[PDB]
Amino acid sequence: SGPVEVFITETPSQPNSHPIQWNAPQPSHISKYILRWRPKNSVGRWKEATIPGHLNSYTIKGLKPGVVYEGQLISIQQYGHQEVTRFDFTTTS
């Protein structure tokens, strides 16, 4: 439970790809992860994916190079509440 330990990782891949990694808390009160991301320019329409709870990393593909995204890793609980982790990351070429 609570905000996840998520970092701006970008291991050798494409600049259109962004392999983020997060590290979970110790209680198993968190089930799913949703990653959502919006290019931090406008605050308009944005994208999301749903990542399973066993996977602690995700590759956000189909992005633009050299742009800043604001990203949120929302962690849904066991049919209850949901927690929100907020950050920004950069994709760079």
UniProtKB/Swiss-Prot annotation:
Domain of life, source organism: Eukaryota
Domain Fibronectin type-III: 2-93
Transmembrane parts of this sequence: none
Residues flagged as site, Important for superfibronectin formation: L55, Y58
Result, substituting S75A: Severely compromised ability to form fibronectin aggregates
Record annotation: effect of changing I74A: Little effect on ability to form fibronectin aggregates
UniProt-reported outcome of changing F87A: Loss of ability to form fibronectin aggregates
Resulting phenotype, Y33A: Severely compromised ability to form fibronectin aggregates
Resulting phenotype, L55A: No effect on secondary structure nor on fibronectin binding nor on activation of p38 K but abolishes polymerization activity
Role, per record: Binds fibronectin and induces fibril formation. This fibronectin polymer, named superfibronectin, exhibits enhanced adhesive properties. Both anastellin and superfibronectin inhibit tumor growth, angiogenesis and metastasis. Anastellin activates p38 MAPK and inhibits lysophospholipid signaling.
Name of the protein in its database record: Anastellin
Organism: Homo sapiens
Gene of this entry: FN1
